[PDB]
Design a protein around this nucleic acid. Structure first.
Ligand SMILES: Nc1nc2c(ncn2[C@H]2C[C@H](O)[C@@H](COP(=O)(O)OP(=O)(O)OP(=O)(O)O)O2)c(=O)[nH]1
Ligand SMILES: [Mg+2]
Lengths: 552, 406
DNA sequence: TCGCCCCCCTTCGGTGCTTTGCACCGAAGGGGGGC
């Protein structure tokens, strides 16, 4: 057990410890538990307790990836709710694309990591638990933890914090050695020759041992490929460990959820992964065991992903002396894929962006969101933003940020011609169109009624009113604009009193979750010139007053 | 030395705000700054059992190329007891906005001489991040009055007065206003002569332990109506809609005659002649919008709010108010950088300047309604920030129905 | 029958608007991956 000082911890104010009771376990988990507990007690990790301690929390056991060994777990859900809050110090996950090439690499792992860190003496009584004999012939033995238990809310942060303290003397003394520290897994790379490197490792292991952290040989990797964080590290490249996608004749909601997660995990190095059609299947469902038939689109999408995954891929490592470059391509239906590299055709990693933000948006906004996601990921992994290669003309972007009323920006980027390009699908005229018909549109619904009308009058004498059922105030106003675009020629001037409808359309959306707004977008794209003007309602303005008289 | 007891507001808990990602150069500067503050006892290393956190980042001005550590204590300041109730607050001098030249001095380092109530220190925690998450976050908390905490000027108030009293009685018409970590020092001397005595104030505070502003040339921008000699239906619609909106602000503005002028269902391009009794309404309402609104007075017990609109080609209009349509100030910001193309940098610079004017005028910053997507602002704004304070803000999408400020 | 972290996709519910539904946003459900 580490001689490191313990971290003081408290229960939330006014609360007590857990008094939950043990449940039955198979008398093969019990043997493993008794083997772990009798040995944990001899090492001082746990202590026998008695009836003066009135707390308890159930125990169970799952098996480790090393198949022979078991993992002891305590269902501390009740204790966790009553335990103080913590500030978690794990801020993210290291990525292999952020590693620099090293001459010598070692991967180490601590044995019994949590059980080597002592627990606050005053807190130990709350960790009371009872290991069970089958059939309750004998009463079980009660114990308490003296070290960090697996299942308690505070154990990960306290271990991570303590591990950082223990490592800090070695890091300060050796700034030429990089130590990636993830829980108890230590990646140690350097540019030393093999002999001096192994001496530094021996010294690091001995420093850990003095502080109570063993480094068993079974988890001491010294030769490539190194198994690390779900990857394989080679000297010049890295691969993700094999991804096996489920294959089913009948899919449930839960199966599809797992499939999408695997594909998301794969998208970090496999270029071109798409999950929109498969994730669409999850919408509107109400049970994880509900069988969902794959749509034709989802089958095609799945087959495309399967083709991509059958190819071998790898990432390379980071060269700080070269620029970072991020290239984005459009995939359709609000899906985007990117690659980050420094030399052409040698990806550091890949990724995808496909979030639908807002009810109405366009490709230029979504491209901007992809750029921002990539920029944040670049800061996290490499500490700097990359130079971008974007499938958008400079004229397009320039027309966007001059016409759009919100401030927006993109960092240094170079145009790359990889169709389909990102473009604006229409642009409203800044001045009225001479010779174009002028439509005065208006819609109105009755708030308690759920019935309304949309219509228009026209300087050319045309007029129209459609009655609407199960509508809203805002829908009728969109519906009135829909009619004007529907009945007008290639050029049209439209006057509305709905700030709501003007706000949507003036942002030039090319996609919408509303089918009504999507119909409007489709009509705007087919037009040649559109001028959209606003006037205040109920002020008897020429044109608007007559169409409002008529929607009544 | 004895500390002042401080509480959070009743029913409030300390801040719990996650640290955001930082570039390599900012993490490095934070590590070098914090390890020396560690050595000098200003901060102490802490662990995860402190459940509080506040984001930390760094700025490096073109005024001085050393990195300045910035802890965004906005959440902590909102939850800290007010010091007007504690009776240790700072009064604002009305003569500051009059001066010819106001220089801003960063005096936050003077706070590190006074210790912080040991029971309040846990609320000042922050976490330094790690490139590619090689390492868990590193956590510190303050032992002294922190920079950026609103209680630091309040607690240090008595000392700073004694530090300044010699200078200000040797200079009775220079006005000094302390806001957060800053001193706003204004005079009525030649722009070079004024700088000479700023150098003397710095070296005066230096024995114990910037930005050139000119409030005289901050111009208010009113609602101007366009002047053409021929007017279309659309021109008159735009004009009637603008005046109708301004009728919520100004007094006695009329539109019925122009409203009648657009009678019928006319083409938007048809030029309509202006009636004798329509021309009068325009020039009549032109002059209501001439000179300021009557009956609008600043209330120091309410918050200031600032709206900003992008107008294109580097122009940015803004209004500061406390109640809607009761603007205490309207303005237009414009800057030259020579890049020509950065909306987010321009807006960030517009915010600092607007907030700076409010400090000079009223003594506090307004809460900004920013015409930008939250995620676009948060991706870039810290790259352009140069102030030791940070105002409150919120994000609005701002469909401009009216062309009212420009 | 556990814990903590990051990621994506979907759903739900709180907030403010010179609203009466709508858009926005954060949290929480599901999944992937790590120790
Ligand atoms: N509550 C909980 N904690 C886990 C789990 N898996 C890993 N951890 C925590 C506790 C571990 O002690 C620590 C290191 O993980 P390891 O797989 O290396 O197990 P450990 O070091 O305890 O034993 P070993 O490496 O096999 O000698 O991370 C889990 O499934 N549940
Ligand atoms: Mg281990």
């Amino acid at each position: 057990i580490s001689p490191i000082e313990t971290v003081p911890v408290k229960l939330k104010p006014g609360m007590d410890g857990p008094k939950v009771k043990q449940w039955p376990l198979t008398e093969e988990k019990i043997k493993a538990l008794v083997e772990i507990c009798t040995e944990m007690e001899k090492e001082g990790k746990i202590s026998k307790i008695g009836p003066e301690n009135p707390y308890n929390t159930p125990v169970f056991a799952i098996k480790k990836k090393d198949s022979t060994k078991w993992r002891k777990l305590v269902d501390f859900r009740e204790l966790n709710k009553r335990t103080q809050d913590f500030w978690e110090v794990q801020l993210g996950i290291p990525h292999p694309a952020g590693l620099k090439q090293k001459k010598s690499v070692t991967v180490l792992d601590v044995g019994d990591a949590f059980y080597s860190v002592p627990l606050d003496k005053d807190f130990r009584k709350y960790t009371a638990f009872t290991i069970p004999s089958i059939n309750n012939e004998t009463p079980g033995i009660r114990y308490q933890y003296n070290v960090l238990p697996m299942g308690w809310k505070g154990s990960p942060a306290i271990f991570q914090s303590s591990m950082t303290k223990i490592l800090e003397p070695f890091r300060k003394q050796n700034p030429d050695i990089v130590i990636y520290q993830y829980v108890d897994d230590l990646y140690v790379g350097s540019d030393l020759e093999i002999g001096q490197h192994r001496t530094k490792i021996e010294e690091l292991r001995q420093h850990l041992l003095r502080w109570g952290f063993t480094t068993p040989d079974k988890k001491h990797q010294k030769e490539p490929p190194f198994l690390w964080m779900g990857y394989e590290l080679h000297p010049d490249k890295w691969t993700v460990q094999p991804i096996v996608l489920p294959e089913k004749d009948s899919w449930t909601v839960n199966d599809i959820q797992k499939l999408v997660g695997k594909l998301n995990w794969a998208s970090q190095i496999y270029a071109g992964i798409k999950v929109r059609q498969l994730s669409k299947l999850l919408r509107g469902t109400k049970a994880l065991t509900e069988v969902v038939p794959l749509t034709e689109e989802a089958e095609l999408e799945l087959a495309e992903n399967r083709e991509i995954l059958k190819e071998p891929v790898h990432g390379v490592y980071y060269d700080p002396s070269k620029d970072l470059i991020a290239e984005i391509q459009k995939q359709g239906q609000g899906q985007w894929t990117y690659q980050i590299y420094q030399e052409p055709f040698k990806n550091l990693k890949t990724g995808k962006y496909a979030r639908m933000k807002g009810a109405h948006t366009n490709d230029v906004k979504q491209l901007t969101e992809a750029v921002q996601k990539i920029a944040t990921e670049s800061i996290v992994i490499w500490g700097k933003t990359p130079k971008f290669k974007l499938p958008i003309q400079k004229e397009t972007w320039e027309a966007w940020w001059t016409e759009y009323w919100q401030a927006t920006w993109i960092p240094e980027w170079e145009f790359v011609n990889t169709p389909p390009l990102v473009k604006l699908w229409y642009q409203l005229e800044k001045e009225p169109i001479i010779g174009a018909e002028t439509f005065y549109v208006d819609g109105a619904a009755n708030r308690e009624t759920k019935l309304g009308k949309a219509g228009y009058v026209t300087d050319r004498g045309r007029q129209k009113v459609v009655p609407l059922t199960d509508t809203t105030n805002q829908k009728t106003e969109l519906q009135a604009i829909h009619l004007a675009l529907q009945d007008s020629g290639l050029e049209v001037n439209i006057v509305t009193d709905s700030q709501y409808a003007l706000g949507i359309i003036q942002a030039q959306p090319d996609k919408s979750e509303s089918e009504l707004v999507s119909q409007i977008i489709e009509q705007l794209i087919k037009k040649e010139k559109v001028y959209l003007a606003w006037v205040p309602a109920h002020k008897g303005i020429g044109g608007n007053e007559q169409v409002d008289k008529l929607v009544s | 030395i004895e500390t002042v007891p401080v509480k959070l507001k009743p029913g409030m808990d300390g801040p719990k705000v996650k640290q955001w990602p930082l570039t390599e150069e900012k993490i490095k500067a934070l590590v070098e700054i914090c390890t020396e503050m560690e050595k000098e006892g200003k901060i102490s290393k802490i662990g995860p059992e402190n459940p509080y956190n506040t984001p930390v980042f760094a700025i490096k001005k073109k005024d001085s190329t050393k990195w300045r550590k910035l802890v965004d204590f906005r959440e902590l300041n909102k939850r800290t007891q007010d010091f007007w109730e504690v009776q240790l607050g700072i009064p604002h001098p009305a003569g500051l906005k009059q001066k010819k030249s106001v220089t801003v001095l960063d005096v936050g380092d003077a706070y590190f001489s006074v210790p912080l109530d040991k029971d309040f220190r846990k609320y000042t925690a922050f976490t330094i991040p790690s490139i590619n998450n090689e390492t868990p976050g590193i956590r510190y908390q303050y032992n002294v009055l922190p920079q950026g905490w609103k209680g630091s000027p309040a607690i240090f108030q008595s000392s700073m007065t004694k530090i300044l009293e010699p200078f200000r009685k040797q200079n009775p018409d220079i006005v000094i206003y302390q806001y957060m970590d800053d001193l706003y020092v204004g005079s009525d001397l030649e722009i070079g002569q004024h700088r000479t005595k700023i150098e003397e104030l710095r070296q005066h505070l230096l024995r114990w332990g910037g930005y050139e502003l000119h409030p005289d040339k901050w111009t208010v921008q009113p609602i101007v109506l366009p002047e053409k000699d021929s007017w279309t239906v659309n021109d008159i619609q735009k004009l009637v809609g603008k005046l109708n909106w301004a009728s919520q602000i100004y007094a006695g503005i009329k539109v019925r005659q122009l409203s009648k002028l657009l009678r019928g269902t006319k083409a938007l391009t048809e030029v309509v002649p202006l009636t004798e009794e329509a021309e009068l309404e325009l020039a009549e309402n032109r002059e209501i919008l001439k000179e300021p609104v009557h009956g609008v007075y600043y209330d120091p017990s309410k918050d200031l709010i600032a709206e900003i609109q992008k107008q294109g080609q580097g122009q940015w209009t803004y209004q500061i108010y406390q109640e809607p349509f009761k603007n205490l100030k309207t303005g237009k910001y414009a800057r030259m950088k020579g890049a020509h193309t950065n909306d987010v940098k321009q807006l960030t610079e517009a915010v600092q300047k607007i907030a700076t004017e409010s400090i000079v005028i009223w003594g506090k910053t307004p809460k900004f309604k920013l015409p930008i997507q939250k995620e676009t602002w948060e991706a870039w704004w810290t790259e352009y920030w140069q102030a030791t304070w940070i105002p409150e803000w919120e994000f609005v999408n701002t469909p401009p129905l009216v062309k009212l400020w420009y």
